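Lecture notes, unit on binding sites. The following record was shown on slide 14. It pairs a sequence with calcium ion.
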Amino acid sequence: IVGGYTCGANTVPYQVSLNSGYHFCGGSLINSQWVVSAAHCYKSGIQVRLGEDNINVVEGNEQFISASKSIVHPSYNSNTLNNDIMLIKLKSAASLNSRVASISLPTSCASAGTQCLISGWGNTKSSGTSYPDVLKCLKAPILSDSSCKSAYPGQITSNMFCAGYLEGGKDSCQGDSGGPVVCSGKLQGIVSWGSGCAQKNKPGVYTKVCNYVSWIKQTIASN
Ligand SMILES: C[C@H](NCc1ccc(C(=N)N)cc1O)C(=O)O
Ligand SMILES: [Ca+2]
Ligand SMILES: [Cu+2]
């Protein structure tokens, strides 16, 4: 997260860290046994870490659970990043409490101008590399479809939306991938892609979760 602020220990209870000997992607807990993340975050040997703040220190409240299976959307296209969504089933159910809780799936899509909260342990610098120990937060608005498409001509599908600031200076970044974009208590987006980080006229692009609610529910029910 570039241009954000320190969230505060366990203030984002649904945020998860995907770990393979190091933090490589974010994710969101949607129920005691399932996590939603980005398809481009797929890899074998994933350990899901819940209840984290400082990812380099065991502070208490953490729950480390191995992923039993990862389900990348069947129509995911790695070249266009269309359908960049993945479901991860935990080997064992997580213990839900005030520090580890699930986030609700949307019942309808969010409109332009809606303020959302984006979080992650990704790079905090626009020009360079600097990974934080603690979770970072950023409040950002969903942009109009016209502004999104003018920023990324011919690259925005109906399963994507832009969020952030055109003036630059505030945006999600590498390492935030797969993380949550929560608006009014509902998970509306997944950190997917963008051009660089916090560059002017180049807002972040996110997977439009409201288009996948039926797919998520039907997939979870059959696994
Ligand atoms: C696909 C992945 N990039 C992810 C990615 C995520 C967020 C942003 C952003 N500015 N909001 C930019 C990115 O390039 C990667 O190349 O590792
Ligand atoms: Ca920790
Ligand atoms: Cu990238």
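Take-home: The radius of gyration is 16 Å.
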